[PDB]
Amino acid sequence: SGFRDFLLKPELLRAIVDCGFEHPSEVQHECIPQAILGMDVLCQAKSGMGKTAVFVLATLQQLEPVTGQVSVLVMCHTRELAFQISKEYERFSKYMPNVKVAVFFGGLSIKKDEEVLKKNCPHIVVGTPGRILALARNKSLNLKHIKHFILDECDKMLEQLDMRRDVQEIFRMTPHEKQVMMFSATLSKEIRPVCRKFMQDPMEIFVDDETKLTLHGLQQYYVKLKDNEKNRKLFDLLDVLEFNQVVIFVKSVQRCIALAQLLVEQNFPAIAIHRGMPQEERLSRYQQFKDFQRRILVATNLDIERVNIAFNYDMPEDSDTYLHRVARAGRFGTKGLAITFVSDENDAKILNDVQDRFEVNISELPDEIDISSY
Numbered sequence: 001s002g003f004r005d006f007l008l009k010p011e012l013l014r015a016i017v018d019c020g021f022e023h024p025s026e027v028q029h030e031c032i033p034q035a036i037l038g039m040d041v042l043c044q045a046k047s048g049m050g051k052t053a054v055f056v057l058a059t060l061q062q063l064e065p066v067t068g069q070v071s072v073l074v075m076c077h078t079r080e081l082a083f084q085i086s087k088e089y090e091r092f093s094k095y096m097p098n099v100k101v102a103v104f105f106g107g108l109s110i111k112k113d114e115e116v117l118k119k120n121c122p123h124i125v126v127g128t129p130g131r132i133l134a135l136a137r138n139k140s141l142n143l144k145h146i147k148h149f150i151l152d153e154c155d156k157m158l159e160q161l162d163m164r165r166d167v168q169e170i171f172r173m174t175p176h177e178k179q180v181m182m183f184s185a186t187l188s189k190e191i192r193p194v195c196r197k198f199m200q201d202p203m204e205i206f207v208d209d210e211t212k213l214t215l216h217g218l219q220q221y222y223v224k225l226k227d228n229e230k231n232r233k234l235f236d237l238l239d240v241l242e243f244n245q246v247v248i249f250v251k252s253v254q255r256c257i258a259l260a261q262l263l264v265e266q267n268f269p270a271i272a273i274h275r276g277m278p279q280e281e282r283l284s285r286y287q288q289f290k291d292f293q294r295r296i297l298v299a300t301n302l303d304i305e306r307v308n309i310a311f312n313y314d315m316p317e318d319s320d321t322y323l324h325r326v327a328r329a330g331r332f333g334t335k336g337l338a339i340t341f342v343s344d345e346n347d348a349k350i351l352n353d354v355q356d357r358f359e360v361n362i363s364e365l366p367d368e369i370d371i372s373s374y
């Protein structure tokens with residue numbers, strides 16, 4: 001891996017291979033060396049660019065565990081986010097059993113958080129601004145030993161007056177000499193001042209959007225149908241079209257699991273991957289699809305792309321999702337096939353925006369006296 005040029009603890013580099021990371025992203029090359037040396041950093045980059053990994057590895061790397069002491073403080077604006085970063089820490093500390101983690105957010109009893117803090121104080125704390133605040137004031141949470149204060153999606157978090165006020169108070173109960181890092185999708189609607197408050201001459205860093213996905217060199221067609229007609233059409237298209245591997249996109253986690261099932265009952269080498277499945281599992285099944293073990297993939301979400309045909313079993317939420325689902329442009333340079341299903345005017349509207357945004361055309365799927373293989 002290219003993470004070696006980062007010289008991380010071996011126990012850490014191991015977790016990096018199990019997570020399927022082969023190479024670091026631009027923001028990882030851009031923000032990781034400074035994060036590890038203990039500098040205050042302001043790493044800004046468009047979503048999905050690879051930011052969380054940066055503070056997770058960097059802290060796991062500097063972290064020097066002390067029983068009964070919390071050394072890392074991570075905050076998120078939504079509990080859905082904290083929960084995931086908590087899992088992120090878990091996945092990278094896999095070979096560091098001595099390192100402990102815990103998340104605290106509202107929606108749960110504050111008495112359970114205190115139970116964790118008393119029975120098995122963690123070294124890393126993740127959570128929302130208000131609950132943390134409560135624990136710190138309860139006195140259950142002692143923040144006088146924090147050495148790493150990280151704010152994720154600071155824009156969003158700080159663009160909320162009440163929460164912004166909690167982040168500042170928390171910040172004040174923490175030591176003065178410490179590493180502070182912020183990560184944001186935007187440069188924010190004038191959030192730099194609040195930022196010049198937490199960081200002593202921090203390093204501003206900006207990584208431009210990497211790889212503008214394009215709909216060029218892609219054959220795109222639609223197939224008008226009823227929802228009760230889709231399965232037969234899908235299956236008939238799997239007997240006619242030629243491929244090596246295919247991805248299919250379904251809305252709900254349920255539809256996703258019921259389709260791959262049905263595909264298996266008809267002897268199609270299909271495996272599924274939905275939004276509910278935990279990461280460690282998504283990579284297990286993604287491996288059987290990259291390994292070419294299986295031929296069809298039924299995803300709810302979504303490198304090399306040995307896939308020749310991409311399906312939108314049911315229309316994608318909007319123009320962008322379509323572009324981020326279909327557009328073949330990960331690594332190897334080639335073409336592709338995109339067939340989309342439509343069952344109402346809602347789907348129609350979405351496909352029409354696709355034709356307008358990207359000035360492209362999408363005709364009905366054909367097959368006259370020929371086929372379509374070129």
Ligand SMILES: Nc1ncnc2c1ncn2[C@@H]1O[C@H](COP(=O)(O)OP(=O)(O)O)[C@@H](O)[C@H]1O
Nearest residue numbers: 020021022023024025047048049050051052053
């Ligand atoms: N170097 C890498 N190689 C492959 N996948 C990566 C790498 N870094 C991160 N990822 C994965 O890609 C996704 C994006 O990272 P994330 O930190 O959530 O992005 P951001 O917070 O910048 O939106 C995650 O699902 C993560 O597991």
Ligand SMILES: [Mg+2]
Nearest residue numbers: 051052152153
């Ligand atoms: Mg992030």
